[PDB]
Amino acid sequence: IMTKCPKCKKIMYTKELAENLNVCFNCDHHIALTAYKRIEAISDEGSFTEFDKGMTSANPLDFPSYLEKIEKDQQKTGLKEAVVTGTAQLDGMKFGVAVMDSRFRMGSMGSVIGEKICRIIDYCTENRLPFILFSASGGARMQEGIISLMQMGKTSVSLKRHSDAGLLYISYLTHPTTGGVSASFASVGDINLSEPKALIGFAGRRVIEQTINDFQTAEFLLEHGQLDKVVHRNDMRQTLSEILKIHQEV
Amino acid sequence: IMTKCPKCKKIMYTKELAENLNVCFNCDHHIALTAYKRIEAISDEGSFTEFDKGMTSANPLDFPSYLEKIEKDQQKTGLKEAVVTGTAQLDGMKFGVAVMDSRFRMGSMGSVIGEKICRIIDYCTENRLPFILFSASGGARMQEGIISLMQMGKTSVSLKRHSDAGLLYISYLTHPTTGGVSASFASVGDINLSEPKALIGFAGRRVIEQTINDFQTAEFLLEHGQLDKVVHRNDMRQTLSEILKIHQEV
């Protein structure tokens, strides 16, 4: 029943920590929030519907030990894949949502994540609903190779169609948001929000070094123009609430 | 019959210098080209029509010795004002044009320059003609104060309407292009062209010093992203010819 804070190493009683939205009382570090928690933390009680609850991955490139690596994370997490999607309400205002969860294969984006994000984006488009995405990812899933790359295109396509309908897309970048994800849908919100000390970049040092032989923080990205707001999690609900109200189709 | 090159001080026989489009043979410095010369240098023989040949300035703010300062430049230049406008053809392709002439009140933009530039832009819009502007200016004409400022708006308005019709506007920045002019229509071409060593900036040192107590070159502006092309005057005609052909309404 105990989760240790990685920053300051002080041990805590999870019950109250969850009620503080996984924010460290002592040092204010923002611990990861699981998909269903995040969703609960922002939606009206009992208003969540989950889309495509049981969509599993497959193996197009026949990558070794890929399907079993997926089980390890399904069994450990409880999730079928690394993104939870569906519709909810917040202070009376409906919206579609896609929370990514970085425990399941570091939140890497393969075919399932692309298809689920598209299916919700495309739903919102029909029903004219704002859409909110919480990115948490290490980039593209290398096990599906080129297909994972094309997910950047697959997503963007639904998103731009959604934008061309005059509909709000809020990009909520959580720690960590990197690679293909940050180079795709995570960067292109009408409004871009993040969280204190969240790590946001493009290519990692291990990739950049082999590919050609605290600046990634959210506060730094806001100075350098790329975020509308750094939102403390105590103001998350209220912040999202007001944004949707301003963008409420009168 | 002789014009001295300001750069290298070598004296020259104007006849041949004009046939070299006022380019210095010795040092390649690009001497100013008067409005009617510029027009001739780019248009098919006998294809030029001049719009609003006789539009004079007036004095809204009753600025002292303003109307007589205008005469001094009319008498010295032969121009009625500091912009010549009309339609011409180049290798069979019609286009509207506005050449600014920096001898007449340093090519400063007052009400006449705004109205003439709008009248041609608005003509081209009706008849679906590309439009080409040669900026040469020290900024807004301070003698008409706020009205000169609003010329930046007046021009932009016609230009954007012209752009919304899918019509080509080429911005040809000649030495010197500064102030209101560079902060208005001169910067917003579909294609932005300039000339070697032309001086392009925003606020002058005399203005910036009192207002709050070679980086302006065209080659520098092309490195820093703001010009499509630095065009030697030997390739001007050909360059403009091809651009219009590519943008020819098929």
Added chain:
Amino acid sequence: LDFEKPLFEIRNKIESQEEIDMLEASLERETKKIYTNLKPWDRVQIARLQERPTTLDYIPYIFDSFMELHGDRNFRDDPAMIGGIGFLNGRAVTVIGQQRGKDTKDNIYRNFGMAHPEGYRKALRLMKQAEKFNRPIFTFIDTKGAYPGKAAEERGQSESIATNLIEMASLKVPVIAIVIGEGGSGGALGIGIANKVLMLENSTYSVISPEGAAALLWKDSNLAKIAAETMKITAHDIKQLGIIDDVISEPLGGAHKDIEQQALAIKSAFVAQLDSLESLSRDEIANDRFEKFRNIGSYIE
């Protein structure tokens, strides 16, 4: 202040029997006579007062639940140009403006409300968003010109401004702009291509600073008072020319004397001007703005 020298000499003698009552009554009327009858150069120093109300001063009194949005998705978040989204009597709106700073240290932070090119791009981004979601745009002009120098020009200051001018021209949403400080030529027009333009009675709008005009046209910088009077930069001067659509009243002494009193006046203008533009559709409101700026200027055919 320069023109408060007589008021200073009156209250110098009162703070030294029957004189006191008459002098204090005499102070009452003369203080009014001065501030009720203001010369153009008196208005320029009032607009340059460090304590003059900034954009962020006015917003809370005018708009409900204002949320700042930061950045240009490009390079930086310009302190000098702020913007966001809020409400105005129920309706969602976008708000944009230059932020002058209140005290010394804060002026340094804000670069005195002189926007870099990232500021104008941040302004543009926000207005495009407004156009997308059909929100009205209110802008606050309060700048002594856009930030000049190599660095600024080196990142496209000319282009940042010119782009705003052409995008603002065709915005399919109502735009209302208002001068609360100075109106520094192109820096001001860079967020001033509006359907209606309003000014505080003691604000400035001009192609150049009077000190600039003096050093160039009069060839002697120490002659800015005369330049200002010649240049016709007051709210009334501009109103006669038909360049702005109204002048807002200001509290006696200056807007800084009573911020709430002043902010309520700006709202009544904002509301009333916005009601003019309700008849106009998305295409027609763009055309309305076209027709404003297309028809500014005087010449002889």
Added chain:
Amino acid sequence: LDFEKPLFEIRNKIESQEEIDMLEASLERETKKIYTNLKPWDRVQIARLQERPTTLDYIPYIFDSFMELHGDRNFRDDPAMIGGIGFLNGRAVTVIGQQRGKDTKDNIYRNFGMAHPEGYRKALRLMKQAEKFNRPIFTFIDTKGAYPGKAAEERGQSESIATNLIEMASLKVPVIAIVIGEGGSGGALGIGIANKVLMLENSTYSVISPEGAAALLWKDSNLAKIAAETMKITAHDIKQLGIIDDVISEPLGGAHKDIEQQALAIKSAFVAQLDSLESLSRDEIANDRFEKFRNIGSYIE
């Protein structure tokens, strides 16, 4: 080259009576057998050859009167990303691509064809212009990823790429993209959201370099050959998955052997693919691209 070791050992002995004729005939057939039957890793080194034809090599043979246009109206002109306007069998078109550099000093100039964020914005600007004037867009992909590091990210590399992706998605003009060097994941997709995508038979397309894949997945960088074979990055591999629309033939030995021969092949593809998209209008061609990328990927419902 690694797989030319046998060819090296053959011609080593010929350059030392009847042997010579048989060895030289034997060289003829074996040289063909090798280059006609290529392994995936053989294709990766061919694509990495310094002499492999760049974009500017191909353009003169394909397009008439190509004029480079420079800059992003923002910050800089990125050497690594070039673009312009020209003709293709009469019709005006826009052309864009990464520029790899030919010799050492020129590679330094071009940053090896790795675009900074200013490059992608310059690409975007040009395509918006094409859309405006209804010109088809041809893009040349030849990059080992977008330029990484602080400086790059500090000016919005993630955002430069993501913006291209969404703007390219809805372009109301035909887009045809082609891989001639490597296809470095997001750097490549940043100018690769096309109606039809084509590849040179010995080019690469991948989410990561095989050396990258080796250092992360195999936990040992010196295992890139196996990673490459596993990763399925060849032109044929990609063609089977339905991600690209065709594979162009390459001259024996590599495209660098005969640039004109190779460039004519690219034109016949360019022309033929463009003829597919003539039936499609301005709205319908955007939808065509939507429907390509919307339907890529495999999952289990």
